[PDB]
Amino acid sequence: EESQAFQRQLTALIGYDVTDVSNVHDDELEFTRRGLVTPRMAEVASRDPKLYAMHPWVTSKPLPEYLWKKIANNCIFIVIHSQTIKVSPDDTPGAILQSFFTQDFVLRVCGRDEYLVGETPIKNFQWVRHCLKNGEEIHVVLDTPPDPALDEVRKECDRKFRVKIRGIDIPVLDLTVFVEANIQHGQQVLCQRRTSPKPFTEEVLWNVWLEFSIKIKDLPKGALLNLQIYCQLLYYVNLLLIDHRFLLRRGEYVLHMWQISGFNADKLTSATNPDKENSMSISILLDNAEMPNQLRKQLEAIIATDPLNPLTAEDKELLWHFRYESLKHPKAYPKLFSSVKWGQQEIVAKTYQLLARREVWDQSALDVGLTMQLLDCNFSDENVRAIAVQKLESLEDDDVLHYLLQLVQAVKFEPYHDSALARFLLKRGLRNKRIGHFLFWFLRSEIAQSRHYQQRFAVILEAYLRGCGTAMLHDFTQQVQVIEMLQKVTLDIKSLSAEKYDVSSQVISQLKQKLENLQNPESFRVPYDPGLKAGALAIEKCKVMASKKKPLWLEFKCADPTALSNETIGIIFKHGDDLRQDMLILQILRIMESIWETESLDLCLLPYGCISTGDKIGMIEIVKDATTIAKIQQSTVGNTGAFKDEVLNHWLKEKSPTEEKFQAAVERFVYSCAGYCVATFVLGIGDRHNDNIMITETGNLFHIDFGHILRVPFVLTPDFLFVMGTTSPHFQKFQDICVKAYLALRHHTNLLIILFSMMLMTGMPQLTSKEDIEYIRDALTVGKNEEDAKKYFLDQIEVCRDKGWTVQFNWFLHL
Ligand SMILES: CN(C)C1CCN(C(=O)c2ccc(NC(=O)Nc3ccc(-c4nc(N5CCOCC5)nc(N5CCOCC5)n4)cc3)cc2)CC1
């Protein structure tokens, strides 16, 4: 029936068929599809049709200090389409309109799907704050409110634990293998057993009972039997010992395992390898007063250490014995719940009784760095994780958008498909279309290139698509059609000039040919900027990048006729690199901008849009009027390491007509340069090549390519300095802003550390040992007073000065 065709539509939008039961050994996934029906219908029935249709992008945070200095005498100007109007920062849009009349029309941004509606002061609209930040004019058309009808929804024992290892079987690959069974709880290995080593052949039968030290009723929920094969670790797979019904897992299992590549979130999945033809299989059978002062000081010191400082045994004993004292310190919760013997039923009982009375945690102000910690790989207990989700519930949509990528990623750490976190994401995406757009694209990113989690993520994405309404479904469908067309063009063009050729006649020929052939997809929403709709292509402006991986430089017209400007929307389509790394780094940069805003700073970061759409394939926003610092060098002294340091300021002058425009660009440059210095330093991506640093004609600096990130702490070359002048008066400004921004980030050390380690676990595999994570703790001068930290950053600046083009000259000889 047509219901089946609708499920087909959903499948095509998802990129995976959630009704497939070809790679399941239980009904957990379908159980979750069924359990999600209620949160979906409940948020749908709960949301306001009008605000959900117009999706006003609002914030309750106060107006920053740097935006106030840009205001007139309590007088924001709104150009309505077409007269200008004075308005008070605290003037509601409704009051604005009733003032403009002296009845039901709504103000929509010109050239955008963005609306200034709701009982919010224009002070508090992100588009208005963005216009103020960039000194643009709030241009609005008096449109008629979109029909909410277009959002309508298609209505829907004391025995010890034993595991029998029968054997392993592969048709692939003189070695020797043994099997290893672990009872794991949140990366805590409760107990461990091994089989004897038998020669590695395509079939190894043990028929061996591995008896564990843990008793059946001490198994905690969320505990995993982790089965691994060693020759080095060759393969792994995981089975939940308590399923989604709290039933002890019994029966026969034949689990197709994951292969290792010669620690990260894939090693945790409960999913089995779908590739049953080539993948290693394993076969198994289951059948079953108050403290003294010195101790107070020690406990406080422990609670004070950072999220990476590991807890010794005595530390955990102290935290557990004084658990009720520790419960008053919400900052101690991550460490307290790591001091819990989860393999002991009585201790987990005491732990739940502890969580029972948590008035201090409930009342505390939301601390995201703490919530995230509780949501990471070190916490399986769903009750421990549910309090983090509880705190998350109080985030406004603006903050949800700030943290949505890494919350979605954090879903990879949930033991079960249906989690508090999953339902929270579902709710927030259904309540608000901007969150829903990005939830769609993030879930789909992972569903398109992760067998390890595509099933769970596909269940969540289907749950979302069944409540977002048919309008947004049509939008997603158009977008997916367009992106698939364009990825087809990208790959087919990549095939045509594989290596060692810059650009051919035939190449540009075929590219323009296909783009002309493809345009006969009328209009689609820009995935990295859902307020922008792209129209026809500007075939004449589209080109093959002429990079190693020949990415596509495409440009579209804006489909919105109310659009004021005539600028095209530029998108780069790239295949060959894993752009999820870029998504993560850019999202951390956005969090850094947010942190800086809390302290009335603006470092003019340009976190360009970037959506990973598949396996080593994605799109990148084209910042208009931007060029590489390397290219500005080459243009005046081409193919030479001389790197004449006077050239950047000459270029700035050239592109800025008015000396005043030049000074504005120089100040923009001071700020954006300080911001990128601090950010790349903290993240350990500051030692980049001249070619991966771009600048807008208006002086805004910004880095690109966060996959190719490999000595110097960051890039502060003699040419940036010449744009500053070297001591000088603007270089003093640079150092001042840098110390301020660095200290501002050190004020959120914990959040930055948890986000960084999460990125390491969920982005690219690389090394991702403890060692990679520790660098950031170092760069944030953990356990240091702010004075020494400012000294540390100024020492980094001085190393930059001393090295000169040595760094850049070697980057040039190397590339
Ligand atoms: C160790 N090793 C052997 C490997 C191992 C594995 N591995 C990866 O698998 C991998 C994963 C992710 C990335 N990530 C990535 O590549 N990200 C990106 C790259 C370029 C751009 C760009 N590039 C240009 N061009 C360059 C030159 O001048 C200008 C043109 N322009 C723009 N702009 C957009 C904004 O507006 C202005 C134009 N963006 C934007 C993003 C790379 C590689 C790591 C390396």
UniProtKB/Swiss-Prot annotation:
Query: What is the name of the protein in this document?
Result: Phosphatidylinositol 4,5-bisphosphate 3-kinase catalytic subunit gamma isoform
Q: Which residues carry this modification: Phosphothreonine?
A: 749
Report the EC number(s), separated by commas if there are several: 2.7.1.137, 2.7.1.153, 2.7.1.154, 2.7.11.1
Organism of origin: Homo sapiens (Human)
Q: Which residues form the PI3K-RBD domain?
A: 73-144
- Every PI3K/PI4K catalytic domain range: 538-805
Q: How does it assemble?
A: Heterodimer of a catalytic subunit PIK3CG and a PIK3R5 or PIK3R6 regulatory subunit. Interacts with GRK2 through the PIK helical domain. Interaction with GRK2 is required for targeting to agonist-occupied receptor. Interacts with PDE3B; regulates PDE3B activity and thereby cAMP levels in cells. Interacts with TPM2. Interacts with EPHA8; regulates integrin-mediated cell adhesion to substrate. Interacts with HRAS; the interaction is required for membrane recruitment and beta-gamma G protein dimer-dependent activation of the PI3K gamma complex PIK3CG:PIK3R6.
- Region of interest (Catalytic loop), ranges: 684-692
Tell me which PROSITE patterns the record gives: C2_PI3K (PS51547), PI3_4_KINASE_1 (PS00915), PI3_4_KINASE_2 (PS00916), PI3_4_KINASE_3 (PS50290), PI3K_ABD (PS51544), PI3K_RBD (PS51546), PIK_HELICAL (PS51545)
Residue spans making up a coiled coil are none
Catalyses: a 1,2-diacyl-sn-glycero-3-phospho-(1D-myo-inositol) + ATP = a 1,2-diacyl-sn-glycero-3-phospho-(1D-myo-inositol-3-phosphate) + ADP + H(+); a 1,2-diacyl-sn-glycero-3-phospho-(1D-myo-inositol-4,5-bisphosphate) + ATP = a 1,2-diacyl-sn-glycero-3-phospho-(1D-myo-inositol-3,4,5-trisphosphate) + ADP + H(+); a 1,2-diacyl-sn-glycero-3-phospho-(1D-myo-inositol 4-phosphate) + ATP = a 1,2-diacyl-sn-glycero-3-phospho-(1D-myo-inositol-3,4-bisphosphate) + ADP + H(+); L-seryl-[protein] + ATP = O-phospho-L-seryl-[protein] + ADP + H(+)
Activity regulation info:
Activated by both the alpha and the beta-gamma G proteins following stimulation of G protein-coupled receptors (GPCRs). Activation by GPCRs is assisted by the regulatory subunits (PIK3R5 or PIK3R6) leading to the translocation from the cytosol to the plasma membrane and to kinase activation. Inhibited by AS-604850 and AS-605240.
Q: Which residues form the C2 PI3K-type domain?
A: 157-287
Q: Where is the PIK helical domain?
A: 289-467
